[PDB]
Ligand binder design. Sequence first.
Ligand SMILES: [Mg+2]
Ligand SMILES: [Mg+2]
Ligand SMILES: [Zn+2]
Length: 179
Amino acid sequence: MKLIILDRDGVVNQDSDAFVKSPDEWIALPGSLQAIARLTQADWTVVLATNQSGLARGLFDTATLNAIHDKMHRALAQMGGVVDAIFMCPHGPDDGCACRKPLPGMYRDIARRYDVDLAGVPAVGDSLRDLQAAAQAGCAPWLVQTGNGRKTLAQGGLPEGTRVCEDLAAVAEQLLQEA
Ligand SMILES: [Mg+2]
Ligand SMILES: [Mg+2]
Ligand SMILES: [Zn+2]
């Protein structure tokens, strides 16, 4: 198999200062859905690992979150792309869970789901906590410049060997060039 793990806000869809709280607030970033479609057609398994503290904060309920992902799924499907699974942390910053990035919980759950070693698995994020979670779990971190990515890059302290791309479309192009 060829696994790739993606953060959601700031990588697939536009981040929001106010949280993404409804389907209308979920807006794909240019090229991101097409990027997923390319990887899908090249036989990659694409999985999300996303912090969704909006649930713990009571900003929206699981029905609404499922509707957001339904919107994503439909948009991707028409392009021939598929997200195989969504791993998500519903907790807030001080809720003491195992799954909130930068903890590696979700990445560990993904490894268990597919029964794989995460060595060399690309994990794409826009925030330092994405890179740290992925690196701790054994992945190869990739940082995009959408979302929080420019700030993350500027602040440094990235895991050694983190690769930097302008957006998810550029990441997919690089993976497929180097295939
Ligand atoms: Mg993000
Ligand atoms: Mg672009
Ligand atoms: Zn959690």
